[PDB]
Amino acid sequence: KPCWYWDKKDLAHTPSQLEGLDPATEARYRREGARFIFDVGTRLGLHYDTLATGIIYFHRFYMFHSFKQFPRYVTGACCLFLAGKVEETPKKCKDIIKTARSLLNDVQFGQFGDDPKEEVMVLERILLQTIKFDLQVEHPYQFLLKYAKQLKGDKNKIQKLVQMAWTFVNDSLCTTLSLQWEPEIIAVAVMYLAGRLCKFEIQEWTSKPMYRRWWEQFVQDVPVDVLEDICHQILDLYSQGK
Amino acid sequence: IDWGKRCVDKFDIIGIIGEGTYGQVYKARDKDTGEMVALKKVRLDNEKEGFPITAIREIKILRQLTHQSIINMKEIVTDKEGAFYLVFEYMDHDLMGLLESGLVHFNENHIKSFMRQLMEGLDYCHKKNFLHRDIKCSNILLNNRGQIKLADFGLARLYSSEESRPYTNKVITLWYRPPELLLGEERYTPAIDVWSCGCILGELFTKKPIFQANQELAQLELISRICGSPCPAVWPDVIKLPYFNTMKPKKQYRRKLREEFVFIPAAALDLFDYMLALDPSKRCTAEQALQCEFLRDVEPSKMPPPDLPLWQDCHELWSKKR
Numbered sequence A: 001k002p003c004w005y006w007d008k009k010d011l012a013h014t015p016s017q018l019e020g021l022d023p024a025t026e027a028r029y030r031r032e033g034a035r036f037i038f039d040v041g042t043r044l045g046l047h048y049d050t051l052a053t054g055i056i057y058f059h060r061f062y063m064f065h066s067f068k069q070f071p072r073y074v075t076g077a078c079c080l081f082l083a084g085k086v087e088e089t090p091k092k093c094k095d096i097i098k099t100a101r102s103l104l105n106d107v108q109f110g111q112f113g114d115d116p117k118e119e120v121m122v123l124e125r126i127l128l129q130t131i132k133f134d135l136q137v138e139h140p141y142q143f144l145l146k147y148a149k150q151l152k153g154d155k156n157k158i159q160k161l162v163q164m165a166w167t168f169v170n171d172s173l174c175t176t177l178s179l180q181w182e183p184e185i186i187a188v189a190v191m192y193l194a195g196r197l198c199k200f201e202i203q204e205w206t207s208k209p210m211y212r213r214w215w216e217q218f219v220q221d222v223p224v225d226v227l228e229d230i231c232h233q234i235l236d237l238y239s240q241g242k
Numbered sequence B: 001i002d003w004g005k006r007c008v009d010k011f012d013i014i015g016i017i018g019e020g021t022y023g024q025v026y027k028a029r030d031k032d033t034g035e036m037v038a039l040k041k042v043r044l045d046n047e048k049e050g051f052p053i054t055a056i057r058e059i060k061i062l063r064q065l066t067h068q069s070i071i072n073m074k075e076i077v078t079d080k081e082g083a084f085y086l087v088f089e090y091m092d093h094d095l096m097g098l099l100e101s102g103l104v105h106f107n108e109n110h111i112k113s114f115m116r117q118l119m120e121g122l123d124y125c126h127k128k129n130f131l132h133r134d135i136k137c138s139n140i141l142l143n144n145r146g147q148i149k150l151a152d153f154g155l156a157r158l159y160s161s162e163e164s165r166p167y168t169n170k171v172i173t174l175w176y177r178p179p180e181l182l183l184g185e186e187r188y189t190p191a192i193d194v195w196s197c198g199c200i201l202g203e204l205f206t207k208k209p210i211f212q213a214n215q216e217l218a219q220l221e222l223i224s225r226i227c228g229s230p231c232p233a234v235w236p237d238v239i240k241l242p243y244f245n246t247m248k249p250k251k252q253y254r255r256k257l258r259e260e261f262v263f264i265p266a267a268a269l270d271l272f273d274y275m276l277a278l279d280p281s282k283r284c285t286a287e288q289a290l291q292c293e294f295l296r297d298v299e300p301s302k303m304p305p306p307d308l309p310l311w312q313d314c315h316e317l318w319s320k321k322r
């Protein structure tokens, strides 16, 4: 299997930055592409894992190609289309195109040109090559559920934790976080963020309550610093406003 | 390393050795290394939902499976200039071809080895939570070194061994399809793959497949007339199956398996019997087949290969052509 994780230096030297795209514009392009994938799949009633797989293909695609050369919504549609097949929840490309037409305005949908379906189909060869045919991907949801299920203190507070952390997983998908850290770690980070916002002491819900570093039971060698880093990146989406 | 990017002209194409679901299958040779490979071509322009979901399935599952008795997908290459080609280790034969060739004889010791290898692959494949669902002779490959690999994962899928959830009913080819499927089970187990292999085992001792009909009702009848009629006395849960009442065979036949196949050696026959239990819960697991007398001590690496034709690749396509 190939390596799908980059550090901060790398993410500042993507093919889009190399062609002069400012970091802020590439960050907005990825958000828009990700939310577009999320919105189309949702209206097609797709599994959350299928959306996530689509978005991860999307984020990976643009570590190898530039937004100046590949319009982001066309790629989005292509990635959802491929994710559907991979996750055994297929949607016809024609359905993805109509939904795309419905959600985008004229200029945005202009990206698909004269034959929208065939712009998606030709991109699929390139997509598959770029992700190196490594189709299987795992997401933070399953780990959030697995870990929370071993927490024991207050049924109600624990559910508030899970629900809010779930929302943060959704947010995290709009950012390069999946290019930076494994799903397990993101899962731990969103629990940590939810706990702090809810003023919950998560330690107290485990077998070792006097130990502040409660997450070591689920993942190995994750420093507090990394968790705080993930938190700030997620919190940035609640930027002043937004 | 990075698949899909190297060009197919890195290979010299020798001939079509198979026609496949989503493309032709070729024998070819690596121009650099001299290695023999098989290429499964994936056509993309003809079909309008693009890259075939079936090829996607084989790719996803084969990449998770690594075992000496399961076929290895080496890489994926493209027409560079546009189709893709799945690249596998080249296997000189498959079992359907060899059998219908009449160029080789498999004695008990060859059968010992084949079944040992096939069972270790299925066990690995079952203990990773996958069902194969299309075990039959054309999907079992054999190289000239005498090594078995289970192949054709196009119908495989994950199954839950914690929970019990429903799966597709029409999955194994008919002559190798188990009684519970024929009676309409949807919450089935890996026992359906063991039934198939039990048919292979018989088919290796006899000339032809052991249960041949053209419709499901007639097929269940054929099974019943040898394995005994499905009935609660041997299979209590049989009454909970959708088609039990509508598909009852002509008679309530008593099992006569050990009679109808008395030519099969004792140890082998015991395995055969145990693999062809009507009740899937009474059917041996792959792990259990391997603890049986017939295979328990069998070590394939220390056994000589049968003398396979070194001059003719015996695959399914070549056989039905001639």
Ligand SMILES: Nc1ncnc2c1ncn2[C@@H]1O[C@H](COP(=O)(O)OP(=O)(O)O)[C@@H](O)[C@H]1O
Residues within 6 Å of the ligand: B017, B018, B019, B020, B021, B025, B037, B038, B071, B088, B089, B090, B091, B092, B093, B094, B138, B139, B141, B151, B152, B153, B154, B315, B316, B317
């Ligand atoms: N690795 C291989 N080496 C040699 N022959 C192969 C190989 N893979 C497939 N074949 C031949 O091609 C045929 C079809 O391939 P298979 O994988 O079974 O797909 P399908 O049965 O879906 O068409 C097989 O019966 C076999 O004869």
Ligand SMILES: [Mg+2]
Residues within 6 Å of the ligand: B138, B139, B151, B152
């Ligand atoms: Mg096959």
Ligand SMILES: [Mg+2]
Residues within 6 Å of the ligand: B021, B134, B152, B154, B155
């Ligand atoms: Mg097949």
